[PDB]
Design a protein around this ligand. Structure first.
Ligand SMILES: Nc1ncnc2c1ncn2[C@@H]1O[C@H](COP(=O)(O)OP(=O)(O)OP(=O)(O)O)[C@@H](O)[C@H]1O
Ligand SMILES: Nc1ncnc2c1ncn2[C@@H]1O[C@H](COP(=O)(O)OP(=O)(O)OP(=O)(O)O)[C@@H](O)[C@H]1O
Ligand SMILES: Nc1ncnc2c1ncn2[C@@H]1O[C@H](COP(=O)(O)OP(=O)(O)O)[C@@H](O)[C@H]1O
Ligand SMILES: [Mg+2]
Ligand SMILES: [Mg+2]
Ligand SMILES: [Mg+2]
Lengths: 470, 474, 470
């Protein structure tokens, strides 16, 4: 639209001076594309996001790509609008960077695609809906003791190396296998290794066309790692505003979204607060998570993983998100290093839709008996360690005898773990889950060896494995 | 134009007039002949950091720009030498005579260029090989306090690569030079020097040099990877690199951050650590695996830099001084150390035995915490304590005595199946060495079976061979 | 050539050299003024250049108090750094930071050789290393963390822990044995201890083998900065040009860094860490690197380091910890307990605790001692909660022998005759190992624990137990 010269470069931060006085708005997009005139110059193409107005026709911009080789006096052009990711049917089976440019070598998107600005005012109470709909995943622990909800936000909490990304991937796979719905996956500051693994797993599963992917890698400047989640959300918008269906949006690690925001604030000279966090923390978190709502048309249900640093949940980044969550799942390393997979703590995981009238009273009663037995077992293990299983009385003995089997049967083999153990994997219907747990609690299978329950799906698979072992 | 006077000089930083066509990161040289990088471009001045002895510079000196980025000379002739961050020898012995040069600021291997990590990297440390396995391409972090056996693990790793076909690099950042010499002599005495390169950026060296040292190491590692050879790289301390970067940034008047660290810490360490990779069969299958080190005060794992580096890496090896002085060396906390490539970067018999070993250790780790205090226990409670004690004894090994994998898997097979029940705990340590000798002399066929097959030998042969030794032992 | 003073703020001054010539960094400037009237004060001052400012201006750290300075004063440029008198003349004499002598015994003529204090460090080719033990006669150091000849020795502690007692004991024994040139530089010490040490040396006659540079608490920060460098400069000549083995003693090195931090804010440096200057590690490594043993000569350096709040994790002690080869850390708890000296057995380390240096039996004894002490260290927390009657036989024996051991680590000292009125002792390494082997094996369980307190050799333990009447 209009052009101005660079005046200052201080790493990611760049400053431009629009001499004539026509200034870009905040959150606008600026383009630098240069060709070397002398043998000492370099060729660079750069995207800059405006952040401030500084007076006397100067603006302060955060760069979305590495700023090396910038020269004062080189021309910047104004696009006239925010960073606009192309959206539509053209983005299925394709992988993009933050700027909405295809990472894949399968091709380049043409000018035909409709382009949606990443930064848009959040939906009003124009049509937001209060209705509650349960989403089935096929995982016994998750469906039984912490049901997820359409349009709701679900949180996965744990340390490093506990099982979050495997759970996210098998959620994607099972949703495509049974529900058949679209999904969108965005990685905030993702590792190249795990992103490559995810692409290869989706290609093997035949899912890549169902889902879409936006990648933001750690070696990129902080601003891109910040904005990648918003461009992924803008991709997810189209499939429920225009195509009007039940969408999912996955986010790799919001922790990095907060960290990148803090780092950008530091680069901009904003005064720190709390534990080094930026001044505008919750205004960013809320502006992210308040566009993820189910109107009458579509859900944009979200499942998210967030990293807790040191087994402490009081850090500002986990604390702010904890005020947005409809269901929360806590993953424990002690489970992860046991034979019980997936590592999901029954007692620490809760959902606001576990109400008896939402899930049905049979579901509620079965879940409540499950949790009661697990709590009694946790209490009794202290006595068992010192005095043994034989010291306690018959009621406690039967309680622990059922509790161990419940602990094992919560585990099940899944289709993404084929790499790790060479076993196929299973899906369990929700009514089958509740019926099996009801039969276990009622004790129809007291005679079976406890090993049969270790990693199978339906209870008849326990019967088959018991037949196999002998 | 290119000519301009220097208007300020101090603490290894300068500011200059003119230079209106300079570029970010461009190398700049003074009339004194020392060189420096232009890092900040302002409305009428340039901020320059000096890569050398700066005391000679004065106000009014004219300054010039080279027109290039910093290039590290790369060649096969560097192996065995000791070098600076710059491409200049400091070991004597005359010029290294490299083939050519590479810019140190480069993009990393991207997505779809990488295969899954499937081939092991062998350290010879029973605990690490069994319970925290590593593969070519993995970015495993080793983190701990002072004097808890950190660099002995890197030296053990580099020494063991003699049997394999690895290329290794050791980068020392901000350390005392006599420590560099002691490590070089330790390596040379064990014969490892010919397949290694040592890069030295001591603390006395001008601060920008310590800023460039890790990238100096990766530049050579990348050349060797793209040729197609496997590479192992060790950074001895990223903490001192962070300190040098903070000092350089503060002198430049860039706005501070959490612990006064600048806002570019994560950007810099990720730019550094994303160059490690495992390349595809199309590229050539080369691999640049990295083992960065971080030390931080008093076992507080929760600081800025420790959490950044923990968030960037694929695993952590946690070293505790508490465990060191308890008689368990090298002091590794198996519970707190995370392995994300556990079963994929192991040979088949290692997977098979080590899964049960980790099950035993995890079972023992909780019962031991409090059951010992109650002297009277049930019969079966104490048995797991005995098993865990024998396990922790079996995982201990002397300094600079790395082990081949097959003897490890043999002794761990002896452990897991309960063959060590008769042996009192004190005899267990001698049992391992005498068992190794007996298998070397008598049961060589098992070693041959594992060496050829890459799989566990027939159970009957293993049982007969292990049982035969127990008869001699007293 | 002359320059005019234009600013003065405590330690820092701002000379302006408008003649068309400017001094280099680290140079020395002179002020000599005659009072023109009764109001003016005659002043004799020298200033070192520290930073170049913009317009014919430099920032200069004053070497002495700045009272009486008038804006418009004239400053002479000497054209070279601070010059120190180098040679055999330094032996016996005591000097100040600028190079003048402090004792009234005489003066040093113009013909003496003088060297600048600032120069680059030795290169990688020049260094050499060895493993030879340097016996101290102190049981704790000899048995648990042996010092090594030619190796850096560090004493770490806060105020009032026993640092200078150890410095004096080591200097007494080593100067009794070694035929080495000695240089003693006191940085930020008590000016009373300097005189006391001078008189003790005159009693010992070692003053002819020693050269001393003194700058203490009552001095402005510049002298506190440069004093250690002056002492090092003298040790440099003795190590290299004479080719004679030298000892360098510095007590409480820290004040070198502290003085730099104090004037750092006056020099325009942004704050860092806990108030420290940004350039901390550069300067500390710059000092420490020059103190090295080469092939031309060897320096055995024994250093004491102070912690501002007794927090070992403080930045300054943390940076220094990386430059040492043997460290003894003294902390207040042992001083409270009555055991002396206050060295921590489980945190003091040396590069010499290896069977290839000290032998198999010595290494085994030391490591077993440390194991017993760590077992008792955890047992204190256990016993506090449960009591002392719930432990088993072996757990009780651990406490018994740990109590017997940490007392025997206490020794009757020579220089502690004033403080406690006892003779003192020198304990050979073999006797320490024999006694500790007797202790660990339970050969002296019957003796009461009081018999083991503040004695040299286990025979004195038996004598004290005989005195107790057992
Ligand atoms: N297997 C082992 N058995 C006994 N001692 C060991 C063993 N492995 C290492 N050590 C000891 O541990 C120490 C490790 O020294 P090193 O300098 O490598 O450690 P570091 O933690 O990197 O040190 P620093 O914090 O001082 O830099 C040495 O004293 C060495 O003797
Ligand atoms: N071996 C010892 N036996 C008895 N008393 C001792 C012994 N060592 C030290 N003390 C006592 O402890 C005091 C410690 O004083 P010292 O000069 O050693 O302190 P410091 O550790 O150097 O502290 P500072 O840094 O404050 O100068 C002595 O004055 C003396 O009273
Ligand atoms: N069902 C499972 N069975 C065995 N191992 C698993 C399973 N799910 C995840 N893992 C382990 O988790 C690791 C993968 O990392 P992951 O836990 O998904 O990442 P995150 O650090 O986000 O939790 C692998 O080492 C794998 O062994
Ligand atoms: Mg993950
Ligand atoms: Mg080191
Ligand atoms: Mg003192």
């Amino acid at each position: 639209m209009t052009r101005g010269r660079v005046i200052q470069v201080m790493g990611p931060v760049v400053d431009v001076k629009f001499e004539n006085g026509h200034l870009p708005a905040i959150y606008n997009a600026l383009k630098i594309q240069h060709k070397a005139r002398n043998e000492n110059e370099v060729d660079i193409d750069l995207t800059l996001e405006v952040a401030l107005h500084l007076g006397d026709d100067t603006v302060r911009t955060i760069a979305m790509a590495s700023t090396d080789g910038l020269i004062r006096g080189m021309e910047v052009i104004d696009t006239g609008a925010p960073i606009s990711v192309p959206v539509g049917e053209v983005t299925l089976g394709r992988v993009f960077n933050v700027l909405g440019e295809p990472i894949d070598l399968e091709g380049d998107i043409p000018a035909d695609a409709r382009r949606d600005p990443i930064h848009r005012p959040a939906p009003k109470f124009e049509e937001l809906a209060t209705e509650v709909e349960i989403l089935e995943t096929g995982i016994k622990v998750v469906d039984l003791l912490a049901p997820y909800i359409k349009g709701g936000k679900i949180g996965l909490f744990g340390g490093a190396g506990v099982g979050k990304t495997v759970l996210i991937q098998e959620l994607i796979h099972n949703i495509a296998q049974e529900h058949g719905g679209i999904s969108v996956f965005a990685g905030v500051g993702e590792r190249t290794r795990e992103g490559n693994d995810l692409y290869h797993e989706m290609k093997d599963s035949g899912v890549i066309s169902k889902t879409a992917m936006v990648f933001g890698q750690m070696n990129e400047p902080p601003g891109a790692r910040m904005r990648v989640a918003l461009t992924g959300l803008t991709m997810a918008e189209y499939f429920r505003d225009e195509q009007g269906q039940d969408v999912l949006l996955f986010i790799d690690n919001i922790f990095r979204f907060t960290q990148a925001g803090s780092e950008v604030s530091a680069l901009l000279g904003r005064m720190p607060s709390a534990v080094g966090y930026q001044p505008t923390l919750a205004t960013e978190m809320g502006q992210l998570q308040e566009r993820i709502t189910s109107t009458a048309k579509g859900s944009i249900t979200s499942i998210q993983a967030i990293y807790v640093p040191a087994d402490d949940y009081t850090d500002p980044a986990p604390a702010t998100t904890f005020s947005h969550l409809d269901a929360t799942t806590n993953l424990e390393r002690k489970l992860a290093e046991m034979g019980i997979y997936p590592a999901v703590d029954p007692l620490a995981s809760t959902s606001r839709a576990l109400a008896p009238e939402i899930v049905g009273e049979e579901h509620y009663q079965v879940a409540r008996k499950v949790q009661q037995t697990l709590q009694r077992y946790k209490e009794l293990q202290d006595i068992i360690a010192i005095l043994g299983m034989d010291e306690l009385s018959d009621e406690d003995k039967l309680v622990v005898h059922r509790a161990r089997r419940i602990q094992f049967f919560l585990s099940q083999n899944f289709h993404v773990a084929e790499q790790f153990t060479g076993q196929p994997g299973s899906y369990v219907p929700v009514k089958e889950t509740v019926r099996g747990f009801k039969e276990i609690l009622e004790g129809k299978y007291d005679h079976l060896p406890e090993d049969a329950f270790r990693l199978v799906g339906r209870i008849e698979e326990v019967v088959e494995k018991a037949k196999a072992m002998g | 134009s290119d000519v301009g006077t220097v208007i300020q000089v101090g603490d290894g930083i300068a500011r200059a007039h003119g230079l209106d066509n300079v570029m970010s990161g461009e190398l700049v040289e003074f009339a004194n002949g020392v060189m420096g990088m232009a890092l900040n471009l302002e409305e009428n001045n340039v901020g320059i950091v000096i890569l050398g002895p700066y005391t000679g510079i004065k106000e009014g000196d004219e300054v010039r720009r080279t027109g290039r980025i910093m290039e590290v000379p790369v060649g096969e002739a560097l192996i065995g030498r000791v070098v600076n961050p710059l491409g200049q020898p400091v070991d004597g012995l005359g010029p290294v005579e490299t083939t050519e040069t590479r810019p140190i600021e480069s993009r990393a291997p991207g997505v779809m260029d990488r295969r899954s990590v499937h081939e092991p990297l062998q350290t010879g440390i029973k605990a690490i090989d069994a319970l925290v396995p590593i593969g070519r391409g993995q970015r495993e972090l080793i983190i701990g306090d002072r004097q808890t056996g950190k660099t002995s693990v890197a030296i053990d790793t580099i020494i063991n690569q003699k049997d394999q076909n690895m290329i290794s690099i050791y980068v020392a950042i901000g350390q005392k030079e006599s420590t560099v010499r002691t490590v070089v002599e330790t390596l040379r005495k064990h014969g490892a020097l010919d397949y290694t390169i040592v890069v030295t950026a001591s603390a006395s060296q001008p601060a920008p040099l310590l800023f460039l040292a890790p990238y100096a190491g990766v530049a050579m590692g990348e050349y060797f990877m793209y040729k197609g050879k496997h590479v192992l790289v060790v950074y001895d301390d990223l903490s001192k690199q962070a300190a040098a970067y903070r000092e350089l940034s503060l002198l430049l008047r860039r706005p501070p951050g959490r612990e006064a660290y600048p806002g570019d810490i994560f950007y810099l360490h990720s730019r550094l650590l994303e160059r490690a990779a495992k390349l595809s069969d199309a590229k050539g299958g080369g691999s640049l695996t990295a083992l960065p080190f971080v030390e931080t005060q008093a076992g507080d794992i929760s600081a800025y830099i420790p959490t950044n580096v923990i968030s960037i890496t694929d695993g952590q090896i946690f070293l505790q001084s508490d465990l060191f002085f308890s008689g368990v060396r090298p002091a590794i906390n198996a519970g707190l150390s995370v392995s994300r490539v556990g079963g994929a970067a192991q040979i088949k018999a290692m997977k098979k035995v080590a899964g049960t070993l980790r099950l035993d250790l995890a079972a023992y780790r909780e019962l031991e915490a409090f059951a010992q205090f109650g002297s009277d226990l049930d019969k079966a409670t104490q048995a797991k304590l005995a098993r865990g004690a024998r396990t922790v004894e079996v995982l201990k090994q002397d300094l600079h005595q790395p082990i081949p994998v097959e003897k490890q898997v043999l002794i761990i097979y002896a452990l897991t199946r309960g063959f060590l029940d008769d042996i009192p705990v004190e005899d267990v340590r001698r049992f391992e060495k005498e068992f190794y000798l007996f298998l070397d002399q008598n049961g060589q066929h098992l070693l041959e079976h594992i060496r050829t097959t890459k799989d566990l030998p027939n159970e009957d042969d293993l049982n007969k061979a292990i049982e035969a030794f127990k008869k001699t032992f007293v």
